[PDB]
Design a protein around this ligand. Structure first.
Ligand SMILES: [Mg+2]
Ligand SMILES: [Mg+2]
Lengths: 363, 373, 374, 374
């Protein structure tokens, strides 16, 4: 088995409800298998990544893995590392496509190639955008009615907007109508000062069941808050590499991690990082930055093979954009979704929907 | 004085009071007990029990106990049963770990030692502390109202402590259900009672912290065995204001040293057969007592034979550090022996007969499965 | 794909050469191996070995291994051998610990899965790293001169790594003797060699510190398994400048997390049947590699069946972190199976046949002590 | 079994050969001993000794030992001498600290308990460990050359372990002298020997660090009791690569816990009458053994009666943790009792007679200074 051709595509994913610049990769083998992978950074200020950067890195990564056996995930990973440091966003698309191929060649859905299907549907997270306390509360109520159990709620008010008091009120409001078996995550997107986070913690009423995600912009700030925060803490932006997780363990920094396929760098590091987190007893939300059905396929299969007591929802990226790049049989039903049973990722990709490839390597 | 014959018995102990539930979907319907008798040249007989709490509590199971005894029993034949440290050394030199197997032999030897000396075991392990020992219930997992009713029944029987088993999955209601279980179980509390919320190593740190946040203020509760590993427990310890007791994580003497070095806990669940019998219960008592750690003196589970070891040890434990003795008679319907230790005057009192104070019903044990000598 | 039948074999493994000596007066003369075959509905057979190193290396013994398998083997009947994590979970739900017993079943499932995928295990576990894996010698306890000479035999045979056993009692000469044993074993070293001083969890901290004081300056040595407990090892670590590798104290994935949290060591001795098979070896390799811990890839002891698992795993390990593979064929006289992986040009190379690459001598194992299923 | 009568005796023990100097200008010329006998209703008599090493070793003196016995002795009358923990509790409830006074009563109760059971004390405290117990040679403060010569004398007699006293004032030569003493004492080193540099809580951290810097590399030495306080010892520990043994600072069981929590030491000097008798010696041995701390088993000083307690405890102590017993008979010319435990080839073995194995010369003790009596 040999990689023979790699096609790099660029396509715009309009926001459901600006747009996202997606890079979609196909990899072909000498036996005639095709694997697919997606990497689409969430704008250019979520982490140190942007779409133009993803494509510029692929100029180096794609030619380097030509002729390799797509099943040898660690050696392909090493080849990518030896070619270009970091740029895990670019690694992700290639890595995912190789795993798609590998699972196809083994006659397995990806969830069965990555440990085995855990029984039942994966709980899907509801996303609650930044707004007034009462508005966020109503959105939570709307999502509750649709069967969603887990909610990611956005916080991060400037002083002018009302600061820590506003964020505290947003949290209390979102939890006000809660029913048994629900789970809430306040995501600050690395945006609070330690002073803001401490004031916010003081302002919260007692007896709330809430997890705090990505409170601060840097490691040192997050470590200072950690010393004076009794809430479970989940890290997202700050966890990109496997070494990041080791540092977090060393510093006893968090109780959970936000694992995003294209942030961590594809199936290969998602699996390494899941093994580390699981061993550490860290809960894991399994998501991606943003993407089409292709991104969703990687998320779902990985979520499906994650131990349920550690899993804290999967993200359904199809809810984020209007894009229709592929079919996959995994309907959102009752706040949950199930990985399909077709070999590989289970995608039927609409090649024409992607536009002519911006770049081709091989022949 | 010389050990001449060792007999290994196997029997089943049926659960008393309905399916017993622990965290992570573990269920127990009966318990597979291993009962050992040891004979001396002088014609004394000593008894010991080791009954793992199924195969899913710690790294031990009844088949493993018996497999370990195949090496341990022949190893100690010919030894003086009064020389507890040297017999222990012999067992260690023969087979690492397997404290479940050491336990039954170790207890039988102490039974012999005490009989030879004409003393009850409590008066061979430091001396009787005045008054009865308070007894503790084992409240298996169920709904908050089901668990609260079990607490009430034990209250009416004269029990003063209650070990309440928590550890709900997200699907079942998670930390909120566990917090509800705790509040319900404490709701009818009378003066001079004591409660352990035992998660049996079943919570993530995230679940524990959420659970802690949900608990109403002003509760008198001790948290037991919150997490599956040493590193998780340390992480929770850094952010938990409640007193913490460790159980599954404390098996060896070196375990207790690590706990002290890490300042990991304020008490220890000492279970006769988890620690490995009288000899290590005494060593671990000395360590815990010096560190000021409270001690719940229990076993995994067992018959009256297990109960005699538990009771005599609790009876010689300083009362200010003792946090109840487990009365296993409430956990199974088995009647493997008589012991004159009824629940009265506030709990149970060790008998004054030499040894463990047991009258073993051999007809309840079945024919031995293996004999050595 | 379904597991249909599991056979438990018990076979004796006679020692190769002379009496083997570890610290604390531990001597060894022969090995009690348990060998497991797993069959599928499709007619594939996978093989796995678990052979505790006597009964005092870790909390494991062959009788215990077999007793545990009485619970484990029937629990995995009917399962898909390819779903390693779900099979792992089933085993954990059945019996806590007893990774020795998990190991034989887990390895046989990986053997099957790699066969079904048409790949040698090294290519199913990340992919073959180029070139042979260097092999480590196992230098048992003796006088310094005898040890030095045993290092020579192995050197001439193409060995670059040496595990040297230390741990003298005070009567025997204590830390001075151990220091002499170390200096003597390194005395004839040629470029590219690597030395581990393995105490097998047998030194007091006082003994270790005394020994460290007695060693001459300028040695290239790694200290393995100095002390019997976590707390003792932590105390030594605070006052030891040598790289430390943990062996007996690392059995679970959570053990490795605790070592990281405590910044306790710079390497780990990963033994297939100690960690519990291919599945935990892969988990623990991912954790060790992320922390930049070096790894010696070994087993307790075993036949060619143990060796197959060791070798394929070592072959997919990044070479800069790898610190040799144990060749178990040097330790036993058993001929339980054929494998095409001889010592040549730098070490041993995993064969390219799908699976473990074993051809099992089925009459050499004896009639199964127990069978489950069909 | 009931305690019926307690007799308190006082007797002088004349120094034998070499008047001791401890750090800080401390001097000692004879030792004021307190000896207690306890009688039972069944006609058994047990014996116990407590003799503080002068009045400046730890917070104890002979006059204080006797003043405390005025409270402790009547408190334990009518008690069952076999219930060691409950007698201990009664003593603790009666008077805090004063473990020197507890020791004499406690040892006598264990003597009775052992005789009642018809076992030597080593067999009542876990069981006799095979072979003689090594006995420590004591090397008093002197010139490096004189100390070296005395080590050579003890070496020729068969002693293997040496306790060597250090702690020179600046005027006397400071850290340089202490380092020279240490270097000299180890210069004629033969295999299987052990060395303990005892500063008797006498060094400043500055002095200790200077002494450590001055020592040549490659020495096999253990440092005992370097500093006067817990906080000083902690500071030294942070910057000292040698194994550390605490003596004066470890008196209670809670002290050992504090040492574990602070990771302060690798060994402990257990002295029967410092720790408070057989009962606390056993508790502290259990703690230390679990922590892997080495233990030197000694007493402050004493007659054969003190030696009986030392020897029996050392005899039941695991040999890999044991670092010699002190033969107190070498420290005085007093003949207070006969015990069949001759010193031969640098070792001694506990006798087999029930109890401590003493044959006490009542005439050598004088009339009791106090009888209880209540
Ligand atoms: Mg996030
Ligand atoms: Mg001293």
């Amino acid at each position: 088995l040999k990689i023979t051709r790699i096609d790099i595509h660029r396509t715009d994913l309009p926001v459901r409800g600006h747009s996202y610049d997606a890079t979609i990769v196909s990899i072909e083998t000498d036996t005639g298998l095709t694997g697919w992978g997606e990497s689409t950074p969430f704008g250019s200020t979520y982490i140190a990544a942007h779409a133009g950067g993803t494509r510029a890195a692929l100029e180096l990564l794609a030619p380097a893995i030509l002729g390799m056996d797509p099943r040898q995930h660690d050696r392909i990973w090493d080849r990518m590392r030896d070619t270009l440091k970091g740029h895990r966003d670019a690694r992700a698309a290639l890595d995912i496509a190789c795993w798609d191929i590998a699972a196809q060649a083994a006659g397995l859905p990806l969830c069965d190639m990555t440990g085995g299907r855990v029984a039942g549907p994966v709980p899907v997270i509801s996303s609650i955008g930044g707004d007034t306390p009462e508005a966020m509360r109503a959105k939570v109520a709307r999502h509750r009615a649709q069967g969603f159990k887990g909610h990611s709620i956005k916080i991060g008010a400037s002083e002018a907007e009302g600061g820590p008091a506003l964020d505290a009120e947003r949290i209390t409001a979102c939890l006000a109508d809660r029913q048994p078996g629900e789970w809430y995550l306040a995501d600050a997107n690395n945006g609070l000062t330690v002073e803001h986070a401490l004031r916010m913690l003081s302002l919260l009423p007692p007896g709330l069941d809430i997890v705090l995600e990505a409170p601060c912009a840097s490691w040192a700030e997050t470590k200072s808050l950690r010393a004076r925060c009794a809430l479970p803490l989940l890290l997202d932006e700050l966890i990109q590499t496997e070494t990041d997780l080791i540092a977090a363990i060393r510093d006893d920094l968090c109780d959970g991690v936000g694992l995003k396929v294209s942030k961590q760098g594809g199936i290969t590091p998602m699996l390494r990082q899941r093994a580390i987190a699981a061993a550490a007893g860290m809960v894991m939300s399994v998501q991606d930055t943003v993407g089409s059905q292709i991104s969703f396929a990687a998320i779902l299969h990985l979520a499906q093979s994650t131990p349920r007591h550690l899993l804290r929802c999967a993200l359904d990226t199809r809810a984020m954009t209007t894009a229709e790049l592929a079919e996959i049989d995994a309907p959102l039903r009752d706040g949950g979704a199930s990985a399909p049973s077709d070999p590989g990722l289970g995608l039927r990709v609409n090649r024409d929907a992607l536009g002519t490839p911006v770049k081709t390597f091989g022949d």
